[PDB]
């Protein structure tokens, strides 16, 4: 195998004296070379005062400079990185650092006091103790590199109840990163100039980004705060050649490209990337206009990585396997051998191998529901077009099904997002009748503006919706329930309003 | 890990229709589905007559449609194919096949008579006998699909005494296919028409090109004779995306595409390949004039696979490492940790890592000269370049020391190629004078031409060559001892003419 730390040491002697970590906001820049001797001295500190092979070390904290060499710092040590958004609230983090029976937690953030008093016995160290605008604070001799099982846990980043911590073997490291490269487009060499939109708690943050960008002897350039225009001139000032970003910062940064013109310059762009399956036609439209580079459209997850994509996507919801993938549909709440009629619906399972998760830690009845005689489950309902691609429908857990019949609530919200007044839309089925659940919308309305059940229905009738789609009943509320970080509480919206 | 059948099987579930395997010249296509099931049932049949996993399995066969399935088939059941040059002489293969310890022997060729007759126990299987034009033989049911370990051999191949067998372990195919794409820009995709110039016998003809077509869902078109005007029309036909070619193959097609001119269509062809480190520049010239695509010069070995390589090279001698690899300069004769001083001359050696080979069969002295410490050792000599990049300068044993000075053949013989009237010229140093040995030109003239040496010496005066490098002596011959499959046989030279 190639681990993350190895991958980092080959591409440092490779590239000793290029540009690994630029931080344009700080005035700030790191060679490969001066990367790694801060990744030796924080990993030599932190084994100075304890810290030993396979521990668990939480951390907590937006994008930056200094975690990125805190957290490889932890890799190098041998200790297991579990990642956080550092939006959860301070019971949330709490409880997850409790439960995840965590050695220490490096933070940034009053969340501190709640760890001490949650009973966990985690070692609270502040980041900038650790490292400071790149610059450690460094104590004891050089340190070993322990060694590395290709099964082996490497690092913990957790899902979309509470999140479920998922543990990355060793061995999953490469084909994380890969899949840049043979699917994606990317190369190795020091042209390579990778934007950090993407947070680092998150897997493609970490591995398709911050990992992938060291890998190729590239850079890495910082984003400590996402800003549409600030983005657009570091693409011109830094010559970025790849960036990774959600459907919001996409919709951003088109528009503000847009009311730019060539204004900036952007054709050192050559490859945007996304994972579109919930992206609006509207959005992708805007994309091709307004922004430069191939395309590519992504489906993963953070159990398996990459298992679907589209060069040029024309929807974003419809889309192929790459290298590394082997994918099936089958019938829903059935064994990974049930493979579905061609056309009908079923839900995506992805085989499991080296990119696997090897499990939730502490959590195996979760576990055994994901991970099925060598397949990963997604949860996600999809249909094989007639094209040979998969066509994304949405989440099992969020099918309506009414008389019968699967309806998605993604659809409809397309739909109805469309509808002049509508600022959000949430579709969810109420336990109900007609029977089983009955297709109810929740529109929030925009600034000022009234909504009408009546008029919403109209515009459903002149839309593509087939007449079982259509919502029964409308709700038109001033706010929908979102502290599952915006995402919203399907469930306990249903709870509100039944 | 992801070995070479994985790979295959893992293609054909994404691109079951798509086209695997095309001969134009006898018609002939298979579809990725279509591919499988041969492989599975020569496969099935080879485990019918006895053949069992690990058990090594000789390939003596020029590149066909029939003996991609025959060595796939022999992979697929568990063997380990050992791929064998056909130009090699009866006695030669006779000779390797018995030193082998070898199961059975594949062969399409009186080689036949010799291997019965070399007392070796190995079944003779004609390939014709096993698969025809794409259609197999079948009888047996399907079989198991025998376990394979990161460690346990999965090929041989054999080097450039006589060739010595480099095992490869299974864990090595994936890094041996996926450099086609980090550093070559390959990508995954059925889009990939991949021309099967190289032979399947060497690690370029096998991992490189034909693993790397089908395993990136591409399409490999087979080469059985290579005639370069045939060549440009497959590309223009066939829409091909890529080539690997040799050196000499590069010369025919430029000098093809240029006496066709835009008669030829070549746009397809984005990516052209080659190993060109004892590539002239002329030819290159050529290439980059005459040629489309990007051009991309790669070194590496049958040990290690890629090693250094260059996007858009100006010399053929100069290149960097890529992903995958690691790479140091050492003192000749010294420890893999005696680094040398930055300009001064010393063995290319590359790190051992998942890529490299196990160890040569049956020979542990040869194995233990090669691997050291983590590393394996090229036998290269390079020097780095002040842009910091590494020239290579030719292999230690032909280096010529005269005086106390390294003085390589190779630069030599790259300005004395260039005198007018010369066909062929090898350098050597002979045991002599002035001391050590004395350096030593031996050219061929061209058809009706005298030669002197008189002229020569004015020549190399009038070039570039420091005056220490002047050849001493020259030797004027009709032929050059050539049974190393053209390469030379620079000790027997020496013997000849000392
Ligand atoms: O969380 C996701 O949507 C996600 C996770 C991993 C990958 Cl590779 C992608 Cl493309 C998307
Ligand atoms: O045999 C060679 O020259 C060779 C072997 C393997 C590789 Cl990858 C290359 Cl680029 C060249």
Redesign the interface.
């Given at each position: 195998?190639?681990t993350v730390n190895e991958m980092l040491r080959?591409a440092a002697?490779?590239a000793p004296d290029h540009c690994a970590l630029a931080v344009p906001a700080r005035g700030l820049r790191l060679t490969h070379a001066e990367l790694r001797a801060r990744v030796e001295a924080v990993a030599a500190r932190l084994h100075a005062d304890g810290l030993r092979p396979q521990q668990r070390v939480a951390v907590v904290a937006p994008n930056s400079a200094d975690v990125v060499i805190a957290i490889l710092a932890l890799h190098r040590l041998g200790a297991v990185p579990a990642l956080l958004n550092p939006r959860l609230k301070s019971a949330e983090l709490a409880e997850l650092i409790k439960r995840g029976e965590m050695t220490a937690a490096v933070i940034a953030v009053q969340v501190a006091d709640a760890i001490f008093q949650s009973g966990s016995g985690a070692r609270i160290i502040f980041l900038g103790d650790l490292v400071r605008d790149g610059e450690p604070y460094s104590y004891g001799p050089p340190i070993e590199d322990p060694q590395r099982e290709?099964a082996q846990p490497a690092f913990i980043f957790y899902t979309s109840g509470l999140p479920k911590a998922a543990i990355i073997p060793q061995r999953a490291a490469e084909?994380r990163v890969?899949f840049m490269?043979?699917?994606?487009?990317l190369?190795?060499?020091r042209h390579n100039v990778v934007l950090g939109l993407m947070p680092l708690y998150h897997v493609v943050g970490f591995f398709a980004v911050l990992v992938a960008a060291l890998?190729?002897?590239g850079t890495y350039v910082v984003v400590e705060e996402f800003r549409p225009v600030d983005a657009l001139q570091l693409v011109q000032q830094e010559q970025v050649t790849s960036l990774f970003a959600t459907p919001t910062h996409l919709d951003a940064l088109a528009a503000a490209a847009a009311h730019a013109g060539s204004s900036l310059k952007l054709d050192s762009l050559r490859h945007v990337t996304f994972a579109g399956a919930t992206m609006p036609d509207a959005v992708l439209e805007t994309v091709h206009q307004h922004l430069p580079g191939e395309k590519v459209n992504a489906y993963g997850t953070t159990e398996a990585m990459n298992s679907l994509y589209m060069?040029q996507p024309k929807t974003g919801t419809e889309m192929?396997?790459?290298?590394?993938?082997?994918?099936r549909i089958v019938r829903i709440g059935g064994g990974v051998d049930e493979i579905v009629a061609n056309g009908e619906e079923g839900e995506l399972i992805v085989?499991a191998?080296?990119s696997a998760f090897v499990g939730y830690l502490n959590q195996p009845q979760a576990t055994a529901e994901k991970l099925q005689d060598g397949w990963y489950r997604t949860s996600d309902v999809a249909v094989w077009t007639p094209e040979g691609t998969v066509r994304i429908l949405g989440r099992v857990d969020d099918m309506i099904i009414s008389g019968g019949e699967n309806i998605h609530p993604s659809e409809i919200e397309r739909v109805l997002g469309t509808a002049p007044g509508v600022t959000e839309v949430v579709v969810i089925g109420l336990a109900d009748q007609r029977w089983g659940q009955s297709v109810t919308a929740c529109v929030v309305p925009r600034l000022g503006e009234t909504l009408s059940a009546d008029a919403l229905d109209t515009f459903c009738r002149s839309s593509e919706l087939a007449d079982f789609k259509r919502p029964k009943r409308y709700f038109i509320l001033d706010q929908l329930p979102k502290n599952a970080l915006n995402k919203v509480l399907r469930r306990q919206l249903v709870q509100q309003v039944s």
């Open positions: 195998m190639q080959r002697t490779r290709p084909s890969l490269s043979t699917q994606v487009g190369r190795h060499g890998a190729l002897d060069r192929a396997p790459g290298f590394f993938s082997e994918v085989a191998s080296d």
